Write a protein that binds this ligand. Structure first.
Ligand SMILES: CC(C)(C)c1ccc(C(=O)N/N=C/c2cc(Br)c(O)c(Br)c2O)cc1
Ligand SMILES: CC(C)(C)c1ccc(C(=O)N/N=C/c2cc(Br)c(O)c(Br)c2O)cc1
Ligand SMILES: [Cl-]
Ligand SMILES: [Cl-]
Ligand SMILES: [Cl-]
Ligand SMILES: [Cl-]
Ligand SMILES: [Cl-]
Ligand SMILES: [Cl-]
Lengths: 149, 152, 151, 149, 151, 152
């Protein structure tokens, strides 16, 4: 269930500054994942969002949830397989029911909670929340398709 | 009351700065009704170092972000017009995002055009929806409700 | 050989990478004769943090760089066609620049179009010249000579 | 005693990408300070330290400890006074007895524990450790000087 | 009056990171010539893309560094070290001519700009000179600029 | 075997990369003994955006990092000679740092010269010591122990 940055880098194609998942704490095939990304002032994004008021972009919180969800889907089908990971692309088709409740700032441990709402073939629907210190800071539902890279 | 604004005017209204100011120019603006704007996409952008190596694709979420900033400009200017002084005291926040669909990937060389329409507005609360287009084709769709709050 | 290439093709031919690959797409290519290409200008470019604060202006020298990169792409595809393997066994370097004029400032939102024609070419030495345009208006002119070399 | 990034910004002169303290959890004038910095893969430093193997630079761990000490120094001297702070900068004078025991990586919450060893005027000597999940990842002593910009 | 460091340069030139390419002024004779330089280090972003595994300071940036040196010369010739007046002026570079690159510039080099006033007629300044590394000429260039009121 | 190495040679030995490769050239090298190298300091470096705004000062800790990297180059070449294929899978870990003292601020325009001497080495563990200099003056002094290791 625990995957670190090294493991993550072998499954996801994302690299700096768009790999928004630092560690995976829980993974239940075909069911759910709990992962997180540490938020620190030392991130380029804060230079512009916003000057004198660092706030992690809501859309990037969603991106982080999507990446966690994609990791879940890929792993549920193929497990930890770097080889096969390079032959697949997990792109997102839709995003819906997104709600932002609390602003995420430097010092926050942005935890992603996604579960498989539904899946058929290579189409997977995940949903859940983003949490900081046990509180729900955002929620969203996403639908992704898995295909040959 | 103007319909065209360039980056210098955008900078005076939106608080966003590099690397999160995703609107380069506004070509159409109709108070309380709609806005048409765009962001040029070029390889010379840091995001492409990671999305993805050897396969530059503009992140769908940033397409949405650009749509929101456009809506936000529309919301503000609809209420106060081009007023930099007051703009510095307000900030627009994403409350919700719905019905997002990504149809075509956006890549360097593309002119990402935002088309937002006002679906409903009451005071500081604005609901907009629209599409992101490239050479006339819809590459993305989205609806979102924003909030015009105090910067402090 | 084709007449249009996208960023994916340009990455396979030019050795330039971020933040110095200043050509996004190729629209017209006529071997040993001319090329029309362009680079989109956006505020979301690091260059603008320093050129200048509160007033984004695409550096004139980078417009020339862009023209040079277009020239280099023409030069190489003229001699080897679309060949990624041979391409990576090369680099191109500026030898001279002349008659450059900066008529109109280039800013975010602009589609910087490069128009180059081969003035002269002999082996790895190419002499190109032309203009940089925005919405059909000349914003800059320049002549440059470059060379493709081994590694 | 609970300071956030915007408070830290008003005291320390450091800015991106050299501001390495995200939050202050404990503060006791002329005694000690406990703070932390989140470590995420989304930090430019990791592009070069090292490729395919992200390790937060040991020297930056020390820098983060120094900044923590600096904040303790500024406040111990003038309390939380953004106006006086804005005129100053901080200079490293000495560094000694530093030992790194465990590598810090993306996903880690790097906590700084510094106490005052000695001080006089603008010159402050502090020492302590850097910890992750309650375990000491580094030790250090350092002397710094606050000066007029 | 002769030696200006980075603090001073920052107060006269509007350029900022990543486009301020002059680190220190070592010699300045009002209305005559300027000698200044920029250190080249591998720890510069441009090297990420110019070129991977082969760091080479872009030729166009050498010309930019020369342009900046000329601008500081022109400005200081007219008003001396005056940060306040500096904030209200701009120097548009109109043309670049006869540039030639003889030796590549790389990390570890101390790129020295040697500019001299070729002509000054009104708001127009024509400067020229060379860029040198360890006493050897690595580049040559002529440039014409216009002094104007900021806005 | 050689005594002078340029940035291309440094890239083939040290694992560090942008923005953490802080050695531009090697001017002297005596196996298992000493090394003299330097890094040019320029305003055009990202660290200066934050250390400090309007007052560029090369971070003291990065000076130490530069000395360590100098020692590392010395350590590796003393072990396997100039062997890029072997160096390709090694990394360097800081173990300790002692008696570091900063005497003069390093600023843009400075040629930061590292002078390291081997105080003791055994296997992968090198205990190196020396100074950093600008125009013949001691700008800093430090003692450090680093360990060369294989990427696992
Ligand atoms: C949802 C839609 C239609 C806009 C879409 C479709 C495809 C893609 C896509 O191609 N994503 N990733 C593609 C990709 C990534 C890497 Br890495 C790669 O080596 C290759 Br070939 C890819 O096609 C993204 C969005
Ligand atoms: C942002 C602001 C107002 C400082 C600004 C705006 C435009 C420009 C510009 O288009 N060109 N040049 C500015 C400039 C000023 C001096 Br004094 C100088 O030595 C050089 Br060379 C310049 O390029 C420069 C600065
Ligand atoms: Cl947001
Ligand atoms: Cl995407
Ligand atoms: Cl320019
Ligand atoms: Cl380390
Ligand atoms: Cl060049
Ligand atoms: Cl320091």
């Amino acid at each position: 269930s625990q995957f670190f940055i090294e493991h993550i880098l072998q499954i996801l194609p994302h690299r700096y500054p768009m790999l928004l998942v630092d560690r995976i704490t829980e993974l239940q095939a075909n069911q759910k994942i709990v992962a997180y990304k540490n938020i620190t002032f030392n991130e380029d994004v804060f230079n512009g969002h916003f000057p004198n008021k660092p706030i992690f972009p809501g859309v990037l919180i969603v991106e982080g949830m999507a990446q966690s969800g994609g990791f879940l889907a890929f792993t549920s089908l193929w497990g930890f397989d770097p080889e096969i990971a390079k032959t697949k692309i997990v792109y997102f088709m839709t995003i819906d029911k997104v709600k932002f409740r609390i602003p995420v700032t430097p010092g926050d441990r942005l935890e992603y909670h996604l579960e498989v709402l539904k899946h058929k073939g290579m189409i997977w629907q995940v949903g859940g929340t983003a949490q900081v210190d046990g509180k729900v800071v955002a929620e969203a539902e996403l639908k992704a398709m898995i295909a040959e890279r």
